[PDB]
């Protein structure tokens, strides 16, 4: 019911201001053991998704008697460039858990190791058992919103001292009433609170708990980055504001890192993390 604050005006950084904030970003994650990344609807307005408060966010929009414009369907959208760095990040060792509040379903599509994800809002192509909570990739949208029936069973066969499921499957997306995934919150909250580096990308952090998740680094002595064109509820605890778009911002960081922006070969999941791959030796600093 309470959308929050939305349509708040954008803010920039100068050039020379956000290149050096960009190499200040680089030295974090050089020089932090364990990194967290935060994640918004911002990251996916690149692929023709609105964001929720933004300027022309679905919020923003419905409170102004508009409509919220979408360039692309769910299933034909493509991760950003920002999608495709993090799975990078995670594949050289750099991202160790990767929080999500985007029900979009990019970050499972792009091929990021589901167990090191946190989808704490829902993912549109995922639909779980109400029985033995076993969830479906699917390759389409589940055709319903709210954690209601989609029409199908659980397909889960018969083990040693254990039978068939049937059980009903529901969509994954939750409503204003709904509360968060116990797993994916307790998962989410470990990682912020053992990580010495939270760095949120495209929210406006309005959401609790889901916002206040990166604080939980901050207060047991971590830093705090965030990256987004408008204000945040928590940008007083920040370390670091980067105001500019986060595909700018993520392509200069991978080329600092001197690391490649991975290609998509289409919806590819990945239900495990594999051990880090070889990265570039680290800058003196
Ligand atoms: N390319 C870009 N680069 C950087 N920032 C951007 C970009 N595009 C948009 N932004 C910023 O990105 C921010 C997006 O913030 P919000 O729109 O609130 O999305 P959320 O993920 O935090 O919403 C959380 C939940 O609230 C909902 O009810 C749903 O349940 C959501 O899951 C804005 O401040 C933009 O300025
Ligand atoms: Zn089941």
Known sequence: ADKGKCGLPEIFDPPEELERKVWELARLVWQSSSVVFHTGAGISTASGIPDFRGPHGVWTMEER???????????????????????????????????????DGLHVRSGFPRDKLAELHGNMFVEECAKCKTQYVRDTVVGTMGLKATGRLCTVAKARGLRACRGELRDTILDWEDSLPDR??????????????????????????????????????????????????????????????????MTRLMEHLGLEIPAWDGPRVLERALPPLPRPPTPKL
């Open 184 to 249: 994916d919150l307790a998962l989410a909250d470990e990682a912020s609170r053992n990580a010495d580096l939270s760095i949120t990308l495209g929210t406006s952090l309005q959401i609790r708990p889901s916002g206040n998740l990166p604080l939980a680094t901050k207060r047991r002595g971590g830093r705090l980055v965030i990256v987004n064109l408008q204000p945040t509820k928590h940008d007083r605890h920040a370390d670091l504001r980067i105001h500019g778009y986060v595909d700018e911002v």
């Open 65 to 103: 008697g508009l409509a919220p414009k979408f360039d692309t369907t769910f299933e034909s959208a493509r991760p950003t460039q920002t999608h495709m760095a993090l799975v990078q990040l995670e594949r050289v060792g750099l991202l160790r858990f990767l929080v999500s509040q985007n029900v």
